[PDB]
Amino acid sequence: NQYYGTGRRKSSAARVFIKPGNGKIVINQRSLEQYFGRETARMVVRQPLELVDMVEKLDLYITVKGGGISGQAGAIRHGITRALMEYDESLRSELRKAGFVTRDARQVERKKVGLRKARRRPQFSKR
Amino acid sequence: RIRIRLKAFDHRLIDQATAEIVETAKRTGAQVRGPIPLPTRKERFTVLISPHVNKDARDQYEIRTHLRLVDIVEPTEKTVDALMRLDLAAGVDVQISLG
Amino acid sequence: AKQSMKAREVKRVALADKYFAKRAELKAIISDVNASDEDRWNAVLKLQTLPRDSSPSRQRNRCRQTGRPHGFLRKFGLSRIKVREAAMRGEIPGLKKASW
Amino acid sequence: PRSLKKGPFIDLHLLKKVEKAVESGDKKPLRTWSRRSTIFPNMIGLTIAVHNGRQHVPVFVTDEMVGHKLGEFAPTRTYRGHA
Amino acid sequence: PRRRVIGQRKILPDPKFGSELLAKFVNILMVDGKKSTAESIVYSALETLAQRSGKSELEAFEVALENVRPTVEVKSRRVGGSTYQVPVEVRPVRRNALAMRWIVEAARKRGDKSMALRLANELSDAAENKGTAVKKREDVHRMAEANKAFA
Amino acid sequence: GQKVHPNGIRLGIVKPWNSTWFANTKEFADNLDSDFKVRQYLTKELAKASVSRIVIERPAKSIRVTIHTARPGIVIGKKGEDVEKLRKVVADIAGVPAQINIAEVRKPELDAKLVADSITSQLERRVMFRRAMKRAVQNAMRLGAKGIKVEVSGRLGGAEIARTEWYREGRVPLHTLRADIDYNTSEAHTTYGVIGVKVWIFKGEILG
RNA sequence: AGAACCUUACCUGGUCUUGACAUCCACGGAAGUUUUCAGAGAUGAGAAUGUGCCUUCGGGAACCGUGAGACAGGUGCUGCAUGGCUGUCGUCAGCUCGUGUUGUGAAAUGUUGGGUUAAGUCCCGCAACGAGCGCAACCCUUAUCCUUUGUUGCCAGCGGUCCGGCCGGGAACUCAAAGGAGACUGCCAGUGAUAAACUGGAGGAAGGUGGGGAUGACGUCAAGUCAUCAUGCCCUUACGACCAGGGCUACACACGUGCUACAAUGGCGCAUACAAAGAGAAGCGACCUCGCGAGAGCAAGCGGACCUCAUAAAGUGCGUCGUAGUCCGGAUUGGAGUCUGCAACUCGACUCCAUGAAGUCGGAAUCGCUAGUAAUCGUGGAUCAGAAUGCCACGGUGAAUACGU
Numbered sequence A: 001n002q003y004y005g006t007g008r009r010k011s012s013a014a015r016v017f018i019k020p021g022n023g024k025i026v027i028n029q030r031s032l033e034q035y036f037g038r039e040t041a042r043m044v045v046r047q048p049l050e051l052v053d054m055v056e057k058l059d060l061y062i063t064v065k066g067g068g069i070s071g072q073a074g075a076i077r078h079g080i081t082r083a084l085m086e087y088d089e090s091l092r093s094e095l096r097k098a099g100f101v102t103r104d105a106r107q108v109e110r111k112k113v114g115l116r117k118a119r120r121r122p123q124f125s126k127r
Numbered sequence B: 001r002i003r004i005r006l007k008a009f010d011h012r013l014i015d016q017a018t019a020e021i022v023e024t025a026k027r028t029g030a031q032v033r034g035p036i037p038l039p040t041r042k043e044r045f046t047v048l049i050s051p052h053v054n055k056d057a058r059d060q061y062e063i064r065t066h067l068r069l070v071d072i073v074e075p076t077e078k079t080v081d082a083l084m085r086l087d088l089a090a091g092v093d094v095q096i097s098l099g
Numbered sequence C: 001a002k003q004s005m006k007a008r009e010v011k012r013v014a015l016a017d018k019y020f021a022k023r024a025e026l027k028a029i030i031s032d033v034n035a036s037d038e039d040r041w042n043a044v045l046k047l048q049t050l051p052r053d054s055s056p057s058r059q060r061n062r063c064r065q066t067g068r069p070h071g072f073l074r075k076f077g078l079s080r081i082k083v084r085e086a087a088m089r090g091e092i093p094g095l096k097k098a099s100w
Numbered sequence D: 001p002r003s004l005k006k007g008p009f010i011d012l013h014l015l016k017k018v019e020k021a022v023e024s025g026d027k028k029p030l031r032t033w034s035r036r037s038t039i040f041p042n043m044i045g046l047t048i049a050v051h052n053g054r055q056h057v058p059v060f061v062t063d064e065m066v067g068h069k070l071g072e073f074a075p076t077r078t079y080r081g082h083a
Numbered sequence E: 001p002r003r004r005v006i007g008q009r010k011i012l013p014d015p016k017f018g019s020e021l022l023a024k025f026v027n028i029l030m031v032d033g034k035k036s037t038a039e040s041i042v043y044s045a046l047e048t049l050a051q052r053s054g055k056s057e058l059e060a061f062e063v064a065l066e067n068v069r070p071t072v073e074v075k076s077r078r079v080g081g082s083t084y085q086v087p088v089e090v091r092p093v094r095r096n097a098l099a100m101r102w103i104v105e106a107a108r109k110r111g112d113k114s115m116a117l118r119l120a121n122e123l124s125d126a127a128e129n130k131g132t133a134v135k136k137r138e139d140v141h142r143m144a145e146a147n148k149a150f151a
Numbered sequence F: 001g002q003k004v005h006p007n008g009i010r011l012g013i014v015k016p017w018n019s020t021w022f023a024n025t026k027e028f029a030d031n032l033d034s035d036f037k038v039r040q041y042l043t044k045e046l047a048k049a050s051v052s053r054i055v056i057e058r059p060a061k062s063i064r065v066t067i068h069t070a071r072p073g074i075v076i077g078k079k080g081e082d083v084e085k086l087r088k089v090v091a092d093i094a095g096v097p098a099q100i101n102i103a104e105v106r107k108p109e110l111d112a113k114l115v116a117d118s119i120t121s122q123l124e125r126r127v128m129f130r131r132a133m134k135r136a137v138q139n140a141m142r143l144g145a146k147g148i149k150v151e152v153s154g155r156l157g158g159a160e161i162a163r164t165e166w167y168r169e170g171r172v173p174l175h176t177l178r179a180d181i182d183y184n185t186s187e188a189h190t191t192y193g194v195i196g197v198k199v200w201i202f203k204g205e206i207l208g
Numbered sequence G: 001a002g003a004a005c006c007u008u009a010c011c012u013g014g015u016c017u018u019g020a021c022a023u024c025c026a027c028g029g030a031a032g033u034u035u036u037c038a039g040a041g042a043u044g045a046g047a048a049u050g051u052g053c054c055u056u057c058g059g060g061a062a063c064c065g066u067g068a069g070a071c072a073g074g075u076g077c078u079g080c081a082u083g084g085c086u087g088u089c090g091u092c093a094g095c096u097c098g099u100g101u102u103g104u105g106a107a108a109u110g111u112u113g114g115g116u117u118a119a120g121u122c123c124c125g126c127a128a129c130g131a132g133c134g135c136a137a138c139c140c141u142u143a144u145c146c147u148u149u150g151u152u153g154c155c156a157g158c159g160g161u162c163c164g165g166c167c168g169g170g171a172a173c174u175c176a177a178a179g180g181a182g183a184c185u186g187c188c189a190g191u192g193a194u195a196a197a198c199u200g201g202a203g204g205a206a207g208g209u210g211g212g213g214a215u216g217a218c219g220u221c222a223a224g225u226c227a228u229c230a231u232g233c234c235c236u237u238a239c240g241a242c243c244a245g246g247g248c249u250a251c252a253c254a255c256g257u258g259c260u261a262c263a264a265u266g267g268c269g270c271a272u273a274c275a276a277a278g279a280g281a282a283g284c285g286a287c288c289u290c291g292c293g294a295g296a297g298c299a300a301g302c303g304g305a306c307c308u309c310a311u312a313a314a315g316u317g318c319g320u321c322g323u324a325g326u327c328c329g330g331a332u333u334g335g336a337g338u339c340u341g342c343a344a345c346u347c348g349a350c351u352c353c354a355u356g357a358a359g360u361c362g363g364a365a366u367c368g369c370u371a372g373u374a375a376u377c378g379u380g381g382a383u384c385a386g387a388a389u390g391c392c393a394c395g396g397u398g399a400a401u402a403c404g405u
Helices: A039-051 A070-087 A092-098 B011-028 B077-085 C003-016 C020-031 C037-048 C080-089 D014-023 E022-031 E035-053 E056-068 E092-108 E115-128 E132-146 F028-046 F074-078 F082-094 F113-122 F131-145
Strands: A001-010 A013-019 A025-027 A059-066 B001-006 B032-037 B041-048 B058-072 B092-098 C095-097 D030-032 D048-051 E072-074 E083-087 F051-057 F063-069 F098-104 F147-153 F164-170 F180-188 F196-203
Touching: A001 A025, A001 A070, A025 B058, A025 B092, A039 A070, A039 A092, A059 F164, A070 A092, A070 E072, B011 B032, B011 B058, B011 B077, B011 B092, B011 C020, B011 E056, B032 F113, B058 C080, B077 B092, B077 C095, C003 C020, C003 F098, C020 F098, C080 C095, D014 D030, E022 E035, E022 E092, E035 E056, E035 E115, E056 E115, E092 E115, E092 E132, E115 E132, E115 F131, E115 F196, F028 F051, F028 F082, F051 F113, F063 F082, F074 F082, F074 F098, F082 F098, F113 F131, F113 F147, F113 F180, F113 F196, F131 F147, F131 F164
Parallel strands: A025 A059, D030 D048, F063 F098
Antiparallel strands: A001 A013, A013 A059, B001 B058, B001 B092, B032 B058, B041 B058, B058 C095, E072 E083, F051 F063, F147 F164, F147 F196, F180 F196
């Protein structure tokens, strides 16, 4: 019965499963409060659920790999959104409005020869 | 089981080789495992392109070494020998290892 | 580079090839904590006696075509300049311009 | 400095020369290029003209010079002053 | 730029109070992309401020901001031989930003020990209508007044 | 040094490689060296024979050479006399069993390298460079090149001040990756100095 | 893309002169293998083994030896004799040609004009009509999906459990490649000259070139490079070759580019979480043992989605310090040592203990950056015995601002 959505953001890759239940979130066999020490991360993972009143209605099992914390959180959120879409298919519009269906395609820009970074040019001088 | 590690620079060529190997396996023996693609090695190189001096002037080359893992689960009399006999296309280093 | 330099390099290489077994053995002896002091001393002295060009840390990697000491690459055995040329010509297999 | 397990460094030839000198009991200066050679207890009393790149500069060895090397007492560069 | 105006990028509201302005402030405060620390500091400032003035955390902050927002700023046209500073009515989006920035600057300046504490103090000052940010605002206004002839 | 090499930019798409083998980091440099040697030897030998492209391909500790030449008859000589001779020397150079194949180049006026070589030869035997260039261009056009460019540079007519001159005809798109642009180069070692000859020959676009 | 020796081209001495590197004959010796004393070493003198492929036997091809010359050699000069390669204006939208026409002609026209575009982009007009090189597209990469194939990668649902995907297994998901789909102002409305377009919105992972790279027109600067390479006067018992030591690391000073700081958005201590991308056989080197530590010893696994480098750090929590030249800062110097290496004096890196400069945000002025950018945090790679704060790569966190010309 369990529904599913893949999450991806920066170099993170979340695997969100939605099930009907009480609303307990497990991320890599750890609680939401344990895994994400950051409040912002927590908020981002809860955002979609908040938007469509199904926080108490459904449990979700997650496993996430790659990236840092914020990126991971984003990925998770994306996955959740996907799952929701799969599951209801009538909440899509709301999600779209929110801006959660959109895969955030922003990757880190590669370092470029000549430059110290993606865009930082070295210090110039006429003399 | 016979593990087979195909390695080549051209991907198409490698693919062709793999298919051929599978064909060789499948007629003689039975239950060929399958052509599993491993990660490609993208060995990059930067070089200064000026003869003398211009350091920001550079060419960045790479060699994409592709890997194909073909496995054979049942080595029969006919199959292994056939495989041995069969020489593949040039520019494809194949390594074969039973057990 | 000059011819002379190349020749020298070759000579060094040859020496290295020759004296490897002995030199290595000597090194081992010197290292070996479970050994006599006098023996160790002898080994140290013995090493000195052997030619300098026998050392592998003496020989410089030069380009196999031009003998250019700098800008070398190990995989190709060529200096950058020559490597590039090879790449352009199709002479290095698999090598093409990379973008990402 | 050099490892304690390796011992002190002295050039073999130099050492030999020193030994010879000791045997003789002579005090004529020994011209030497081994600046990297450590001074030894037996070398005390001997004059040993160490090369500085250009010329051999005489170094009368003392009790205090033992742990040091020969090149320490034979300065290579020759700076007087800018004005 | 010359060619094209662009739409301002999306900003998430802060997790504690659910405010855009607060988030913006936090961002402004932040240095070296250490957002979290900055946000913590902001929170601390708020809490202390709340304790001091009563009200809410957010409301108090808003009030403080209000006392440092500039109605009018100046810009340098310089069409003549010498430069003429001209007043201009500063827009809603910008004014809010400016006040925040000023506050942050004041906090940075201030001689108190912890950053958060300093920030809180600054906020309090703003609320009361004394301090550094307020002074700056006054100066800005004053300049505009002086150059009111130009319009 | 503005322009990218036209062969080099297209190796992944429309142009293939010359040396076509796999090797690990251990044996790769050595292989390259061997290739360089053999190629050099071949060039030295088959100068009078119009040779365009040597393609080396080594599977299973055995070297397979493929010589693309306009006139096989001179490279082969008597049936399997010259080729055979070449083979053993190639083997020696390599240190492995050798195998020489000889591809016959249809339309040597459309092969760029060959054209370049011809031009160089002409220059060496003291013709008007311009007339040679014209001939090169014209011939290619006649043969059915979608376009051709040739360029010659330095000490033209033994002049003190060096310059470059070039003749284009038809279309020669270099920025277009899918264009089959046969590019190659040569050098005329004249009495006044070297004269470098470049030539681009556009066969047509590949669709895939 | 790495000067201790080497590199090295420079200096000081010590040496060689058909030569270190090749080809050629003549004729002495099979090559080579081992070892001895003097010498800084280069080199200059000794003792042991071998005679292989073939001879109407005037001898041969590999590899040393000697003399003659023919020649070798030159990182010697000219980049203002050159090729090749490179920078540069500038990834700027330009630069041309054929035929026609205009003008005595140099030339013009096309290529200007009305709009529009990132674009000589596109349309419309028009003595121009066409074409080429460039602005675009084709290529790589990144963002969504589908199919295929599932180990060394994965664990949704199943059983077992040493609660480790580890083992039965499963092929779902991630991921891995290979092949397809997808974005074209294609659809909607308005503005526009019945247009090219523009403005908005719908869908969509992505929207107007989606983000980034590669790609550099004709040409310019007698721009750079004869020291990569090649190439059209000079040296040839020396401007060539070998060696040991030194120098390229010097130090009143001036400039360039970086790193680390000046602190509390921090330092220190203890606990603890989340990456990517790479390299590896004269190599990467677990575990275990010893060492305060750098490391040492033993020694598996592994040419590697398997094993190793390899603990990511910033972060988070708890404690402490409380604005001091400090529990900030680490230069400098003394001692003692580890590793590499024939060899760390000149002149390596790293460690430990001590020492604890200047520096409290920097004058005139001056640089970078418009987004996953700057800022900040670590990680890897090349060269490489050893020797990066440089270079080239990788992810983490992650802003501000753009009214306008």
